[PDB]
RNA sequence: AGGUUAAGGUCCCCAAGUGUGGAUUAAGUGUAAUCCUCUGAAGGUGGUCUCGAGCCCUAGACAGCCGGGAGGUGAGCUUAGAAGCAGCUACCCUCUAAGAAAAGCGUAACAGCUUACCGGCCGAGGUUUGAGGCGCCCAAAAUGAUCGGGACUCAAAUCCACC
RNA sequence: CGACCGAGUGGCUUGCUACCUCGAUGUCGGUUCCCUCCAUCCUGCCCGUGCAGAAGCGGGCAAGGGUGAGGUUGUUCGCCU
RNA sequence: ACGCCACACGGGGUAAGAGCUGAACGCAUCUAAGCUCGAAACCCACUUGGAAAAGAGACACCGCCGAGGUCCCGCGUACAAG
């Protein structure tokens, strides 16, 4: 992919529950795997920011409820690092449902975004309410 | 199962029916083809496929390589073509398999199978001298689908 | 199915046994391309800062702009090549021919040398001018020496001693080459190898750690869940298969970790100066204050604080050079904090 | 077994050893004809390649070496001459000579120049969508050609279909 | 250095082991020998057979080791050692006092031993030490 | 205790030959009597050596290159059409030194490309088939390859004799 | 793609045998840690195609490196994401 | 370490394979002699060890009644004793 114009440690793991920033009609979503990765031996599978993930909804509507969807990473508790040196990390941890083409599933975003996330997913990021 | 287990002569002749029951039927259809009313003398070529090693050949061997030969014989001439090919040789051995450990194994009957002394001829086909090299063609077949070597030979044909 | 994996470390480190000299010997020198010169100088390692510097990278979508970078503050002071060696080619490798000294030397170059008090810089040269005419004549390297005392920060005062290479034009150039800095007094600065901005191979005996476990010398696993609180927690499950009845070489074991040498590649040179611009408040932490002749390397460098590291032109480059890079801000804060 | 070979008025052939060298007025050439009780000499006036061997190995070399002396006759006089064409389909391919070896910019629409380093004395002459290489030494004239229609050589994609490339026109 | 050598022998288009052999003899026999010109010794057959052979005795090792020299010197004193019994008293004795030469040292030319020359005119099928020793990553220091 | 042999062996390790006359093999085949132990099969081989038979040839053989390869007529029939060449039947005489009612491609059918058959250049053996010898392919396994090892090629291998 | 019939290689399964140990060579599965084989799953380089391309299918050389995480089950095996 | 720095290209020889010249066998033929290429695989390149390599190594200087060294003392860039 496209560089990520930052170093991240990567604070999700596969199992890990985590929040759906949208209005897609799911509310928490778990990570089931990542889009590219390949680890190694007893190695627990890891996502962070700016990667794309397999996801099943926990919980939400009715309907949304157990799907198999494709998701996209906003937020993470665990710090990044940009090129000057700054550590940033947010509130909570969090990522958006999104299609076949990288384009979000629902109509709104719920909450800031990473600059970086722009970089990648212009469709995601230019839905954004806040873009820090 | 494989002729390793039946090819050589290593046990003594077993073929008295009157005291062996339960024999399977041969495979083999038949044995005098081509134009059997017709005679042996009346042809100018004779070549008969001999067997270079003392082997056993199974009915089911013999049914394989008579068939791929004559079917090759069949489609080279027609199927009443001027010719007569003839498997000179019966499946007169009978043959066990132990199918308990050693203990009482004394095999029951399986097979059929006919032996065959090094030097023999198996077939023997007569054809005019225009057919020769099919008849050579259709044994290159027949000696591929059974155990030993084979030599063939023109007995009478002084044509080459 | 037990699912397949990469061993525990490498193999090509080894023996992994403590360093026989502390001064490290670089076993391979550089190509002859431009002009004469001589292919390595020294330091002593003082500790760590960070710079903001302006993108160099012509092919990065940041050019141009501001980031920030590691670096390891070296004390580069003048060294002097005190003789020139010539080697001869044999059926057997190469073999020291002869040396070539002079009169002028350091006052306290005694402490490790049994200095020559009486020799004949001609008969020596004349040797290997005879030789070269004889085609016979391997390469061409200087002795040198560098001056503790001019590093307060350091308590030795014993000059430490490494033989480095001259390579350059034509064999006969860099002949005489050589024979002009030797005679001067071998006085010589890291100026007159480096410039900023080039890449360079840094060697140095690492920081010694004594004897370590499988775990942290090999990097194997601890043992996991149950089996952590039986009686074993960093030990391996065995030492190998019933057949061979022998223990292999290639299993992770105990022992010396640390106090090797090693050769960092491709690392970059970010400012050659002097002066005190990179010095830390309140002191480097275990080393002192530096105020002269240093040396910026980016990123780190094998060894502890004091130790003599050595310098090489880049034997295998990556990139091409980009030249006096800008640098826009040296952290003076203090490392206490 | 032995046979002659008569030399040419043209040519002037010298021998060293096992190396052989044939100067004629387009050049020289200098083999090795090296083979197990073979001899190959210098009579004054023509070539001698004898053996006391008679076996169909001996044989087979024999005759070969005769082959490779009069290409050395022909070389040196009249030369030998490979003509070739260049023909594409889409992509308007380039072909030149640049320093010692010839460079192909532009196939099938490709960034990256294709190219070869010509073998010896050869010399490559482009007129246009023709070529002709020609040279004494006939081993190196003959690879310098198959070397440039080797270079247009496609192994992914159907060859029937994507027939771009230099082919060689007319063999001597 | 400096071998006061009672023979010299020039092993330049000599077939090794037939050089080798009567070299032990006469070791055995109390002469001091160097063999010279190692790297232009001579060994018949199909090249790639021969060099496979030499190679996978180049693989052939563990801790206890197999130390297999890839220089023509050592190749050669190895096949000698081979002829001696060299873990014996009479036979380590003789084995050292034999010495193989990468070219000339001497001032004198090798004397060539009768049944060892090969005729380069008759015979193409053979490979020189020191094409092995190319092969087998040694640096041609010759 | 002296002497001579047996099995086995005589390039080195290792006592005794780098023995003699001659031939084959290029695979390191092989240097492996017997064997749980030393494998190697059906099938295949213009690898190479030796031997026999039939036919062709200086009235020019086999191959190659050049030239000719003709008309009656694109036979008749079937068919809109078929003309060597879809199919069915026939398969004739002229010209001549040869040339099919055409053997194989090719066209929608023609054309177009060659085969048969004649001539020329050239100049020496050619071609068909039978049998034998040694080798080659067939031929994939686990800590480090092997003929006991080294190493050996007009042998230090294999076969026939001999000192 | 490939029946019949015929010739083999391996020593992973299974069966047969009763040579070695009954004054004991500690079981299955798993785990950890090390070396190896090739009959190659991926990766390099190739050949054919019912090869336009793109995606394949089949075959050759090749053991440098890689071949991972989970749900049921003690399971090996195997089914499933 | 969960943080940060560094870890080729290129040559040489080959396999499968693609070809050149070329004969046995006038022609043809990638092969029998010869040659041009061509694999993450082989060799070099690079890193690490390495005078006990029994052919037990090389050079420069100081010294053989004195060069150098161990012990002692204050300490660690080192360390289980050494
Ligand atoms: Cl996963
Ligand atoms: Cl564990
Ligand atoms: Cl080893
Ligand atoms: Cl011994
Ligand atoms: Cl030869
Ligand atoms: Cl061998
Ligand atoms: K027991
Ligand atoms: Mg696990
Ligand atoms: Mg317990
Ligand atoms: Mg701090
Ligand atoms: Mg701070
Ligand atoms: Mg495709
Ligand atoms: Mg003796
Ligand atoms: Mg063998
Ligand atoms: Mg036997
Ligand atoms: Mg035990
Ligand atoms: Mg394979
Ligand atoms: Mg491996
Ligand atoms: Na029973
Ligand atoms: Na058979
Ligand atoms: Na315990
Ligand atoms: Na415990
Ligand atoms: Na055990
Ligand atoms: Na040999
Ligand atoms: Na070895
Ligand atoms: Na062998
Ligand atoms: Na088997
Ligand atoms: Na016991
Ligand atoms: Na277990
Ligand atoms: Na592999
Ligand atoms: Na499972
Ligand atoms: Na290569
Ligand atoms: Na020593």
Redesign the interface.
Known sequence: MEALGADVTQGLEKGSLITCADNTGARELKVISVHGYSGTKNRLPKAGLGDKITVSVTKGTPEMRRQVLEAVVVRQRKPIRRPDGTRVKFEDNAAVIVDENEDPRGTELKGPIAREVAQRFGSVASAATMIV | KPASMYRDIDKPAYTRREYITGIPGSKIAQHKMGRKQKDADDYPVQISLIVEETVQLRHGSLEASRLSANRHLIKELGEEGDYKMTLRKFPHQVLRENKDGMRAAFGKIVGTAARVQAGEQLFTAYCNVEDAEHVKEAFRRAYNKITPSCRIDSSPAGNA | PQ????RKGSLGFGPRKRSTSETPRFNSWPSDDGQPGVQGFAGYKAGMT?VVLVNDEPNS??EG????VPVTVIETPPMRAVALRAYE?????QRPLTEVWTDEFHSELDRTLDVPEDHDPDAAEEQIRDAHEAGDLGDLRLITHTVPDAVPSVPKKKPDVMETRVGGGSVSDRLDHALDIVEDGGEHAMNDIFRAGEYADVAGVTKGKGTQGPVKRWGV?KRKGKHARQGWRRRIGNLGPWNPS?V??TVPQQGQTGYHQRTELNKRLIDIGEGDEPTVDGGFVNYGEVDGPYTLVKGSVPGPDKRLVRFRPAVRPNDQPRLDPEVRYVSNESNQG | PRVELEIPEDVDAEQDHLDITVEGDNGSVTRRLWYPDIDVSVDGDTVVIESDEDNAKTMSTIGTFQSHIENMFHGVTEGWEYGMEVFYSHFPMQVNVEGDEVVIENFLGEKAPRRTTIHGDTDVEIDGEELTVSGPDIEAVGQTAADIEQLTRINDKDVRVFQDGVYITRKP | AEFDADVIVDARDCIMGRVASQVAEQALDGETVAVVNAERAVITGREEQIVEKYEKRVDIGNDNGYFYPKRPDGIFKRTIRGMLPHKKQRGREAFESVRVYLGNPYDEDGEVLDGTSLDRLSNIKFVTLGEISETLGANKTW
Not at chain 3, 3 to 6: C, I, K, M, V
Not at chain 3, 65 to 68: C, R
Not at chain 3, 89 to 93: A, F, L, Q, S, V
């Open positions: 699912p397949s994996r990469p960070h979508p940041r702009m501001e980031e920030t080619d044999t059926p057997y490798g696993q022998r292999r070489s």
